[PDB]
């Protein structure tokens, strides 16, 4: 499993 | 009809940790790589890692 990717965008 | 290949451990309360072999109904996946899931043994929402789901 690859590592937790940055949920779609950051914050705004 | 989506199932996560991995356990994913939810670090807020938006979103909802699954585990390997769990089944999750995707909701909204047009975001980005992160994707509304919803968990159909209890009945909860929680988004969901794409990298660690995938389509069945």
């Given at each position: 499993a690859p590592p937790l990717p940055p949920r779609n965008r950051p914050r705004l | 009809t989506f199932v996560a290949l991995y356990?994913?451990?939810s670090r807020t309360?938006?979103?909802?940790?699954?585990?390997k072999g769990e089944?999750?109904?995707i909701?909204?996946?047009t975001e980005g790589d992160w994707w509304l899931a919803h968990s159909l043994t209890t009945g909860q929402t929680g988004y969901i890692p794409s990298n660690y789901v995938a389509p069945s």
């Open positions: - | 356990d994913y451990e309360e938006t979103d909802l940790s699954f585990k089944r999750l109904q909701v909204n996946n």
